[PDB]
Design a protein around this nucleic acid. Structure first.
Ligand SMILES: [Zn+2]
Lengths: 82, 48, 255, 48, 61
RNA sequence: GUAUGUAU
RNA sequence: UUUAUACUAACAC
RNA sequence: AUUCUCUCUUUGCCUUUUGGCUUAGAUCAAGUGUAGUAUCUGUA
């Protein structure tokens, strides 16, 4: 009993020192783990069955000093990247 | 709210020379508590 | 400080009585408080009303009621798609509030006008852009099915309606572009018989007597009829299409 | 006052909190811990 | 057994994509939400800013 | 097993 | 069938 | 001779220390027993 009870407290202490996350850390990560796990089932349903809209806030470059040719090549490149 | 009126030229006086001894003389040792040491971050007893 | 308002809505009369109301509806686009301006056009007409705030109908440039663009007379959506002049594009619930507020932020500070020369140059350019873009064995096998009122138009809808309606009383008309066919059904057989002989080998045609997975099968039938029309004008896919063409007729005859 | 709340809703987050006894000890500090954030910024030379 | 009471905690703790054109925009959209939020949390904090641009060039430009 | 949020 | 842990706990003294 | 990568030696740079403030903000490990469910261990 006495040898056994010393070994119990020596293992409980290794848990205390090891983790500092608290209640909010553990509950916040489970929310990530649920959401991530939820998708993997939800995306398989899509294969089984088988801000973007308009920019957040534009802020134009600056002023026409030099720039029309630069924009011409940029439009077609996004289609290739897709 | 919308974005501000674009800023002006800064026009500072010329930056003074610093040296490596000066930038060491402003060395700030991270302080550590007797009481409030939250999270983990273990520190040996010879650094207290 | 009367409103934008075009000439078109104010109406026939020269003298016009109208009432302001300093804080009616917040503007649709802008989504902020503005002034409603009400007036009558004609004798027993239901009275007008400005729908936009001036801040916006500056930027957008239109009759604060009619919303027809001032220069031309076409709608504002119709204008932005075709001419693509100012190239605005929020079309959201919330982003369109700020975007349209941002243009009111732009024009108020630096008065960037709506240049009409470059605008008109876009139109005359678009006008020119439009112009540059622009049998015995049958009737026997047909008569065999007729003895034992719909015509299959093999080899656009409005023209298919125009050319067939003028040859008799129509029951209904169809089309499928992917199918590339249209089943013209007549009210009488006398018309459908007459329309068959009239529209045989005509431009706008094979005029016979009519009889995920569905998308891929119909898209496969499009590539089959495309190579079928191309060959007659003039190899493994052509042979594979012939095997598929033979397999469909066997299912049609058996069923 | 209650009707205007019912056909407008409450204004932007801010207005002004007007201290009181509950939040005096807190708001005392907040200022001290932003008048040391001042004095350091100015005590530290031009590139350290 | 003093230094061994700490090191035994570390070793114990130590032991313990994309298809289509449509599904990528969902993935690409949610990362935009992520970034925009971190800006609202911290007006200034250039790490979150700089990152956000880099990320957009690689995707779009 | 609610206070409080997530999904249809 | 035995032992441990948690969940049952919206239990009971 | 220059540039790029890998390896070793000596030296430099940090993230604020895990958001802040109070009366260290505040108090002190006798719980046990049964029933059901889930997981793990052994029986040429
Ligand atoms: Zn408006």
């Amino acid at each position: 009993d006495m040898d056994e009870d010393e070994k119990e407290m020596l293992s409980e202490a290794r848990a205390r020192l090891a983790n500092t996350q608290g209640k909010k850390a553990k509950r916040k990560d489970r929310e990530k783990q649920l959401e991530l796990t939820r998708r993997l089932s939800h995306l398989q349903k899509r294969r089984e069955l088988k801000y973007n809209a308009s920019i957040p806030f534009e802020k134009k470059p600056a002023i026409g000093f030099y720039x029309x040719x630069x924009x011409x090549x940029x439009x077609x490149x996004x289609x290739x990247x897709x | 709210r919308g974005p501000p009126s674009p800023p002006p030229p800064v026009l500072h006086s010329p930056p003074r020379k610093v040296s490596a001894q000066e930038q060491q003389d402003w060395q700030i040792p991270p302080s550590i508590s007797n009481w409030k040491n939250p999270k983990g971050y273990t520190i040996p007893l010879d650094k207290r | 400080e009367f409103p934008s308002i075009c000439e078109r809505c104010l109406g026939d009369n020269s003298y016009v009585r109208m009432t302001k109301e300093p804080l009616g509806q917040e503007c649709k686009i802008c989504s902020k408080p503005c002034t409603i301006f009400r007036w009558i056009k004609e004798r027993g007409q239901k009275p007008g009303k400005t729908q936009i705030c001036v801040g916006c109908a500056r930027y957008k440039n239109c009759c604060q009621s009619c919303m027809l663009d001032l220069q031309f007379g076409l709608p504002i959506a119709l204008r932005d798609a075709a001419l693509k002049l100012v190239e605005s594009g929020p079309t959201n619930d919330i982003n369109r509030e700020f975007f349209a507020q941002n243009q009111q932020r732009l024009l108020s500070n630096g008065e960037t006008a709506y240049d009409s020369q470059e605008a008109s140059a876009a139109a005359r350019n678009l006008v020119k852009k439009v112009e540059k873009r622009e049998x015995x064995x049958x009737x026997x096998x047909x008569x065999x099915x007729x003895x034992x009122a719909s015509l299959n138009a093999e080899r656009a809808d409005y023209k298919i309606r125009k050319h067939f309606e003028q040859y008799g009383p129509l029951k209904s008309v169809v089309c499928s572009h992917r199918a590339k066919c249209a089943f013209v059904n007549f009210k009488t057989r006398s018309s459908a018989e007459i329309a068959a002989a009239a529209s045989p080998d005509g431009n706008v045609l094979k005029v016979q007597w009519g009889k995920x997975x569905x998308x891929x099968x119909x898209x496969x039938x499009x590539x089959x009829x495309x190579x079928x029309x191309x060959x007659x004008x003039x190899x493994x896919x052509x042979x594979x299409x012939x095997x598929x063409x033979x397999x469909x007729x066997x299912x049609x005859x058996x069923x | 006052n209650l009707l205007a709340r019912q056909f407008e809703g409450r204004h932007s987050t801010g207005v002004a909190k007007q201290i009181t006894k509950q939040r005096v000890d807190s708001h005392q500090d907040l200022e001290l811990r932003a008048a040391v954030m001042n004095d350091i910024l100015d005590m530290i030379p031009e590139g350290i | 057994x003093x230094x061994x009471x700490x090191x035994x905690x570390x070793x114990x703790x130590x032991x313990x994509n994309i298809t289509d054109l449509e599904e990528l925009q969902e993935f690409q959209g949610r990362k935009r939400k992520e970034f925009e939020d971190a800006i609202r949390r911290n007006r200034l904090a250039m790490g979150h800013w700089m990152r956000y641009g880099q990320w957009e060039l690689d995707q779009k430009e």
